[PDB]
Subunit: 168 residues, 3 copies
């Protein structure tokens, strides 16, 4: 990278050709989106402060908002539930964020984690992988079962499929 490239990246999201982006969604600024991910209706992914990196096969559902003081990193195979706010945090692979949840700056969610709807995770909170987290403030309920890790897998898989239909 160089001066002109940094300017380009500040203005033009690097969105993989394979990514479904609903017309009503706004993907603004410095945003890298990986293979087969999907951005749903009225979502806002704005990398104008901290940049945003979204992995592969990850879904950002309707009206969800991604923004951040520091960088926001969302892994591969992640499901971001409807109207969730992922703000400057770090989300490992195979995480399902329950609809309406808010995860604030510098929080870290470990791999194969399930987050209940409407969960509020304040800044700098770390969580071990393989757990169920719920509530406000979000706390660990129990370790995840193989059946739970599966549910996580079916969710992102479903979205891979629905994503095709919304333009094929």
């Amino acid at each position: 990278s160089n001066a002109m490239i940094r300017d380009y990246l500040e203005d033009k999201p690097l969105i993989d050709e394979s990514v479904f982006v609903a017309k009503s969604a706004d993907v603004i600024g410095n945003v890298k989106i990986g293979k087969d991910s999907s951005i749903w209706y009225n979502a806002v992914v704005r990398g104008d402060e901290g940049p945003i990196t979204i992995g592969e096969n990850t879904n950002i559902q309707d009206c969800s908002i991604v923004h951040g003081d520091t960088e926001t990193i969302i892994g591969n195979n992640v499901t971001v539930g409807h109207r969730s706010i992922v703000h400057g945090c770090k989300i490992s692979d195979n995480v399902l964020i329950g609809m309406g949840s808010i995860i604030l700056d510098n929080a870290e969610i470990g791999e194969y984690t399930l987050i209940g709807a409407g969960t509020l995770i304040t800044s700098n909170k770390k969580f071990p992988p393989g757990v169920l987290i719920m509530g406000s403030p979000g706390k660990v309920v129990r370790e995840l079962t193989e059946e739970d890790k599966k549910y996580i897998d079916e969710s992102y898989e479903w979205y891979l499929e629905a994503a095709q239909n919304q333009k094929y």
Copy 2:
């Protein structure tokens, strides 16, 4: 119905001609919206998983989201407050869902129910009719008064008028 009609239904919402749908809203997939209902700014009504049925005189306020693993049924004279998430549940007639509430799959709300702002009702939760429900998790506070039922009517009634002003 037949194969061709089922295919039409997965792509074209059945929206009664009287319904007001803000331009910024997204009504997508298998969705049926009845007479004199209204869909407000940036709402998202997505019936691409469980189909969605919305009754008559029912208002879905700004940035609300209707989606579901299972079928979502919203009755008549229902007021879905700003930014609510109604997901795979059953909402009876004359219900006012407080703004920012989240009602999950298979949950069931009885007729003439008033729900406080910011309420979180998890899946399969059921409630009797004629109550004030409130909080996270949502619980019944008391039974509804005539005064409360009137307020519920005035609410949807106001939206019938406002919707017409958004057409004329």
Copy 3:
């Protein structure tokens, strides 16, 4: 004012030429927005019931909603965090509303107030100036320090820049 002006004001927001309004935002009805403020992606500012007044240098972040039974007043130098609902309340100058908060009708927030993410303030609730409010229901945590008030100023200031960059 007169009949024709009242009718114009009910249909056409008074937006200062200086204000950045994202294309995906809806600014509807009787809304007045002051110098150097900014309305972000997919926000809805609807003054079709109570009118809305937004001061100078104030930012209404993504998917935030402004609406109200009664009048809604937002002062100057205010930061309205992502997905907040500011509903028929009175917000003083230099206030930062944490993302995902809900402030209901007739609530009154004083100058130099910091509100944590996900806070739910019900109607008629009142707070003094110089405090940190948080939770559901929102309560005062401690008075604000100079370091805190600075944070408030830097927040709206950052948005002034950002708004400019979303135009040049």
